[PDB]
């Protein structure tokens, strides 16, 4: 779904498989974070479904022993001197020795300022130990965490369940059409993006000779040239766009290792899974109720959240017993209206839009000899039409799809292509749609605060600040405290600070709250990007200090006070809201749980073979499963006739479904049901098991 999804699917440790424990035999004992996992496997990232704890991911600094053990780097400390030598240890060595803490207060010389430091013992015990006995130390903070979880800012303030949800739901983000970089993040976005393999990078330094939308020619320092081919609108394995746009001009010089072209979810080289959106934390008229999300129509208008999805269709004209299928315009019992979009050879035109129920590839199959009804004979004699002895089976775009047609890849046996035996013609049609954002779509931040889009309001009827800028999204305040994820609040505050720009006024000394702040951070330009690492980042006092200085937008106006709230005006009624409301720029992503992939309906479709019940799933037509619990509720309701209907004349009564359809069409009463074909099958099976079963009347 994105380079993060690919990268995190690599480095994945699965405990289930051939020779490994199965889920049914997986006791609760193995689904635990043993104290030996620190630095070797992420305690946060793991599937939250039935596979909880059986699937994990490697840590960022973890390394694999030749035997297959997982090593972890460490800096060896000698007589209290933290050296720079890195020694890789496994679980046995780590248990044997005594490890320090990553954020131990070193004296900028190698010594510890305080003799008592935090220590992990052999049994996983955490104690305070004099600095003399310590003989190992973590390489850096955020070593225990994986990549996807290390991409979460303000992780140390989040809980564990919501951090798990955010880490698992950062990998399902879809690639948008712009993919702007996040305002506030961690240092594990550039490395994660350039190590994911979805970004073209110049292998040898040189000067850009020719740049275009399809290829880049880098003129190396020594004579030779090299051309890189971008991937324009290539279909990912999960139906997402995979564009690759260059980010260099015709005269730039690039050094071997520089990012030369963006990927699906990248911006200027680093990672970008979503957009930066203005955020409100007020509950608005019950539309953002119980993890419901309100969106401004500006996102729809300017395509802030608009993804491109590419679906492919495959149809093979294959050999048959009664003849050979051919791909041609001549489709039996069809009109010339639907053939307008079809070219001479049968397939649709490139760039010709398609709608649910259209013709994509015209394929005909030899029908054979079959007796026709006398009424059919009379109609054919009346209208003068011939028998048309071949049957029509053409590739029709399924229910609920639209969009243009990008490209057609057609194989043949006559041009010597490697086709499976029995297949004479194969053709692939790629259909792409520009899906907008809409109600029901799933949105989520980086702290696992998910939610579907309840209602997309117009621009005018949304809360706006004093200067008239309307907010873009409206969360709910009740969902923040009970989920223990104020990391979103801290991210919102820091994002507002980054977007507005700040300047620490050191007229009389540097302020005490910013004493430990690094240089070139006391002042920042508007819309500047920051990077708070995972376990060593911006402190709350520093956040307060930054919010104190929030240099005005265009006029003299500080729209956000010290607390981080603002005066919003109700765009529907007009009066200002009586109390300040928190605002800022949170980073949200569009998840791959779109409505168009979920909505389904059925009136009468295909039926199963052995039993006569309808199929299941959206792939076929299929019907919903009326389970045992639903039957229990139906019974408990004092209800009989609805149960009889749903169990007899809707699923299994072979001579009942046609009768009920005819009665509905003609406007007559619904006929009485019959016994179920499934029950008849059960009776036959029992009789086949040498069990004489006889149903008796009296």
């Amino acid at each position: 779904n994105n380079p993060l999804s690919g990268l995190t699917h690599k480095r994945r440790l699965s405990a289930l498989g051939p020779g490994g424990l199965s889920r049914e035999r997986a006791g609760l004992e193995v689904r635990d974070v043993h104290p030996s996992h620190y630095g070797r496997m992420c305690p946060i990232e793991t599937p939250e479904g039935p596979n909880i704890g059986l699937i994990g991911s490697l840590s960022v600094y973890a390394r694999v022993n030749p035997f297959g053990f997982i090593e972890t780097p460490y800096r060896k400390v000698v007589d209290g001197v933290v050296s720079d030598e890195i020694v890789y240890l496994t679980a046995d060595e780590e248990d044997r020795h005594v490890v320090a803490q990553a954020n131990s207060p070193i004296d900028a010389d190698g010594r510890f300022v305080e003799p008592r430091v935090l220590v992990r013992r052999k049994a996983g015990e955490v104690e305070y130990v004099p600095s003399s006995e310590v003989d190992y130390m973590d390489v850096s903070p955020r070593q225990m965490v994986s990549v996807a979880t290390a991409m979460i800012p303000f992780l140390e303030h989040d809980d564990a369940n919501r951090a798990l949800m955010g880490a698992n739901m950062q990998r399902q983000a879809v690639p948008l059409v712009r993919s702007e970089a996040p305002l506030v993040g961690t240092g594990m976005e550039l490395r994660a993006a350039i190590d994911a393999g979805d970004v073209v990078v110049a292998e040898e330094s040189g000067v850009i000779e020719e740049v275009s939308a399809d290829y880049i020619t880098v003129m190396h320092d020594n004579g030779t040239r090299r051309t890189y081919r971008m991937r324009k609108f290539a279909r990912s394995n999960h139906g997402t766009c995979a564009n690759q746009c260059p980010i260099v001009d015709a005269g730039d010089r690039v050094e071997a290792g520089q990012v030369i072209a963006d990927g699906p979810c990248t911006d200027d080289g680093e990672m970008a899974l979503g957009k930066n959106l203005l955020v409100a934390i007020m509950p608005w008229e019950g539309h953002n109720y119980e993890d419901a999300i309100i969106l401004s129509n500006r996102l729809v208008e300017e395509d802030v959240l608009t993804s491109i999805h590419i679906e492919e269709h495959e149809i093979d004209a294959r050999d048959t017993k009664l003849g050979a299928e051919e791909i041609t315009r001549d489709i039996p019992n069809i009109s010339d209206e639907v053939l307008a979009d079809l070219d001479e050879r049968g397939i649709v035109r490139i760039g010709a839009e398609v709608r649910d129920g259209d013709i994509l590839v015209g394929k005909v199959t030899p029908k054979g000899e079959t007796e026709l009804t006398p009424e059919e004979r009379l109609l054919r004699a009346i209208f003068g039409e011939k028998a048309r002895e071949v049957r029509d089976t053409s590739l029709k775009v399924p229910h609920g799809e639209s969009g243009k047609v990008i490209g057609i890849r057609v194989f043949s046996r006559e041009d010597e292509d490697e086709l499976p035996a029995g297949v004479n013609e194969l053709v692939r049609v790629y259909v792409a749609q520009k899906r907008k954002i809409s109600d029901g779509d799933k949105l989520a931040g980086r702290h696992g605060n998910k939610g579907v889009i309840g209602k997309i309001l117009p621009v005018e009827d949304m809360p706006f600040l004093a200067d008239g800028t309307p907010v873009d999204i409206i969360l709910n305040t009740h969902g923040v405290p009970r989920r223990m994820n104020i990391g979103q609040i801290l991210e919102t505050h820091l994002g507002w600070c980054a977007h507005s720009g700040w300047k620490v006024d050191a007229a009389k000394g540097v302020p005490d709250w910013a004493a430990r702040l690094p240089d070139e951070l006391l002042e920042a330009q508007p819309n500047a990007i920051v990077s708070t690492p995972v376990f060593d980042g911006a402190q709350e006092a520093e956040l307060q200090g930054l919010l104190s200085c929030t240099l005005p937008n265009r006029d003299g106006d500080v729209l956000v006070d010290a607390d981080g709230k603002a005066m919003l005006f109700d765009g529907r009624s007009g009066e200002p809201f009586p109390y300040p409301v928190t605002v800022g720029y949170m980073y949200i992503m569009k998840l791959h749980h779109l409505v168009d992939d979920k909505i389904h309906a059925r009136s009468t479709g295909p039926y199963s073979m052995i039993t006569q019940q309808p199929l299941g799933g959206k792939a076929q037509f299929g019907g919903q499963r009326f389970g045992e619990m639903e039957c229990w509720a139906m019974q408990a309701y004092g209800a009989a006739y609805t149960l009889q209907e749903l169990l007899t004349i809707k699923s299994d009564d072979t001579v009942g479904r046609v009768k009920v359809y005819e009665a509905i069409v003609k406007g007559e009463n619904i006929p009485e049901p019959g016994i179920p074909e499934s029950f008849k099958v059960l009776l036959k099976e029992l009789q086949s098991l040498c069990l004489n079963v006889e149903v008796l009347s009296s």
Partner: peptide
């Protein structure tokens, strides 16, 4: 740093790290 075309993303990190990813 350590990436030639890395955009200037100012960091809040307090302590240096010896080992790169």
């Amino acid at each position: 740093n350590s990436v030639p075309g890395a955009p200037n993303r100012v960091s809040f990190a307090k302590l240096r790290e010896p080992l790169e990813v």
